Amino acid sequence: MDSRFAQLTGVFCDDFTYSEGSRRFLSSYSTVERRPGVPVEGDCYDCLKNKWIAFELEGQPRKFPKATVRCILNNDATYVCSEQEYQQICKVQFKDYLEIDGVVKVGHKASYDAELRERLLELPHPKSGPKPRIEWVAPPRLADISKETAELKRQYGFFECSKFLACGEECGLDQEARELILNEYARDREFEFRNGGWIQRYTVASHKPATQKILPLPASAPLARELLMLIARSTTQAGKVLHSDNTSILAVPVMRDSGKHSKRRPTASTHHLVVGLSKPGCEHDFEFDGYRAAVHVMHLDPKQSANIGEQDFVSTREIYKLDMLELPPISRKGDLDRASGLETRWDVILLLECLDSTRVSQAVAQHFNRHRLALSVCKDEFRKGYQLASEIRGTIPLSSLYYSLCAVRLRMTVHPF
Amino acid sequence: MWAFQEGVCKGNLLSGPTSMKAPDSAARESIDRASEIMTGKSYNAVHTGDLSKLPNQGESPLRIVDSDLYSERSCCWVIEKEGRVVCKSTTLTRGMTSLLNTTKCSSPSELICKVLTVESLSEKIGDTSVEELLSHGRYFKCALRDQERGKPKSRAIFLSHPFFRLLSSVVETHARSVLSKVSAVYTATASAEQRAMMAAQVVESRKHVLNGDCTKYNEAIDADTLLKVWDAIGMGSIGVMLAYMVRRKCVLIKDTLVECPGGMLMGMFNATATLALQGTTDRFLSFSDDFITSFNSPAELREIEDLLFASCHNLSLKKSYISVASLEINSCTLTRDGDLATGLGCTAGVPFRGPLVTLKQTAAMLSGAVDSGVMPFHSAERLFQIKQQECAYRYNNPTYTTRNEDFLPTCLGGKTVISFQSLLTWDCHPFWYQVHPDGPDTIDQKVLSVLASKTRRRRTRLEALSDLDPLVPHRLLVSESDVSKIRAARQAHLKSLGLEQPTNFNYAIYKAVQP
Amino acid sequence: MSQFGKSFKGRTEVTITEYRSHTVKDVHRSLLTADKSLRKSFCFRNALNQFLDKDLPLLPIRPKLESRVAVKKSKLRSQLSFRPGLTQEEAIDLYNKGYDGDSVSGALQDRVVNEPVAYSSADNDKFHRGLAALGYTLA
RNA sequence: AAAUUUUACUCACA
RNA sequence: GUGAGAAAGAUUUGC
Ligand SMILES: [Mg+2]
Ligand SMILES: [Zn+2]
Q: Which residues in chain B (209-228) have CB-CB distances under 8 A to chain A?
């Protein structure tokens, strides 16, 4: 019981009658309406329902028996209570906003404010930093992009073949030949066979990054949609060769070898080795029963495979082609070649963007958008935005970055802005 | 291909980067950057501007919205097993429930009122005191933010204690209110394109436009700046407590706790930092770490740079630039007259996730593009047809479907390739209503939602209390017997009506079918 | 021992908000592990079978849109359309007819939708989702 | 073995 | 395949 709610209860019931004439709710703060000779379990009593009603604020319960009906006066101009009638009657009656002293406010000062402020004062504080010097210059020209591309080329070089990009081109093998070649390649590598599926067992890790170079661009990527769909399917269900209309791939779970109790079934964190076939003529050739094909492997974690396989090649290509300029022919190294170049290699580049889970091409595209929209940029700092080699790691991401830079160079050379 | 676009293009047609890399490296790098900024050798973290312009809201009632306090997203809960601190990764709902159980409070509002009205830090609130709450609220867990376009190396996000979330909710609500009062651009009901149009309207007078982004935004917003802003807007002891918790915060990397006295841990107080900038001047239109300003002469540019330095908004020399005929804000690019810049822009592709979710999201994206004028309607029709063909090629197999009904989509064993215009006009079979962007949820969405509800972090044996009477407030206190009675009555009514489960209600369909 | 005394140990009453949040199965998140989840246990196949035979023959037939007006390309603007929520009596009736209470409560709140539109008509009228280029009007 | 501290855990039950 | 326990299990990963 408190005296702060006297006014609140008075306006709650003004002329509300329950049976014919008698006020339904009697305020306990007024002796005229209060019932003498009986205990008071609340600030209001409903004769019709024969129950007590107690008003309290948000988060400030009062000491009343559980049987008493509690009404909550929310701070956002709304009310909550047990009975529907009380909730509705309170809402209409309290349509006028009246402040009841005893409501905590955001600016409330607690008794420990001084102690906490002193503790904050005794804690470390930052030191003012140096004022930067900013010089605005014109955005980089074709020479800077060429320099970046040449730096990448010199630092990393090129592979002798497009390892997994070559899987975008149909090999000269049929379904049965492809399955036999993949199975025999798995057998040759000493992969464990269990429950009709292949598993790659590892014991020790060199714990050093794999060699990184730049993949040359195949002539075209006709089997891009099929390759992505097959990657998705295989990484969803692994161990057996999965076939498409014109190609097939094998997803092998990679598991630790622990002896007898070694893992038998893959979990959600198990990586996969995706093995694909391409035309012969590289160091990764493999022969069996007169069937020759280049076998190329990509090691993907489950998230990487899910990202790669869910991309839409056809829709992306069409959306890009909606408002695209003429694409110049390019060579194996991404250099402009109007004599022996091919315009289909651009599709390959797109496939590369789909195969790269780091999607550095998106960073390059954003920086190139800034470049195109910019009139002046910071000196010796906007250029550094094109040097993303330290951000990524691996053959596929490196090739994607290199060919994104090559695309920027080609755009600046063929369609200068 | 993005490089050979006539208009503007961010290369958003593909999904963002992802990987299973552990978050140790990113969190360690962020903490090291924060420490370096603290030493005052790399960037500026000391606020110098005057915030007296900001109005004071110290007399406003302390209001908490429980909707954002309970959520299925992750959070860190701190317990003391024997004598050491153990940080467990739970859901925000579970963390809030545990906090209320230990403190023995019905609702978060009661907890905050009790915390603000204790005689001493050592006073007990249930099984814990304010001192214990502040000690536990300074612990954070680290995770990786993947699928962020343009960031090949994923950034580190942080999961906080339920008490930290409880205080941050109030602080950010009041900061957002003050921001809305400061300018008309920060209105709650405003889209990115509306904000960009207002920005264009604001900088038409001047000649040059500086489109700027802030570098190390989270590592340069010290607890001192947050406390300064909170005191300027009148947050009382809540702001002091939050600043104290932020100053002593510890991050659990792998299996070791690292102290990070600097920074604010990856966008916990976006509105507060926006206020830290907006209260010192009116020449900027900033949203956290992204802003646009305008100027006429190099002197104005120097003044802008000084203002940015004073407000601890360190300019990003790598990304910020100057234009005369362009305006980039909130990722949206507009011409100086306010019209949308021609080109793809921020159009994002729809990955293959569910036979029908893909179609619904593609319909939403194409509707957005067509309405904005990004592409003509026939192009959207062709793209929708192509997407339907691709979905058929990807999902039309026994694994996902075993039906052959004609009205079904070609990707579910059917033979119907709906026209985009036909779908948008509701001129199709009812089965296609779920594919409409404004239509019901698809089968895949419901299946995935149920499966998620069955996950380890979210699984519970509690008797579900769903399908409630609209007239019952969600703040009403209930017990086990009460929920049992409600469920029994509802099930009895449903069985009387002959329905085993409630019938799904769609606002659009109901409003359309009405006379 | 009941789950109520374990999940809410030390408390005899909790708000409906907390109890509802503890049992939530209607929030969808677009994630990478979607196709795998749908394939697992043929959950999507079973759900499609269930929908085609139990839920599909309950959706009312929605009339198609007819009205449209001539439109011309214009400067980008923001179209604000105010969709009002259900009335109290309407919500009570819909609940009594067996409609899911959660959806009715969600529709109870009045809402406003802002969308960027680059087409205008002579009479400056609103357009339906994605049909501004064709001129379909809310009316 | 590879896009190299990642591709790893225990118990009970069926 | 289900449950529980490891700073922890796939709606993971926050504002
Ligand atoms: Mg910007
Ligand atoms: Zn090779």
A: 211, 222-224, 227
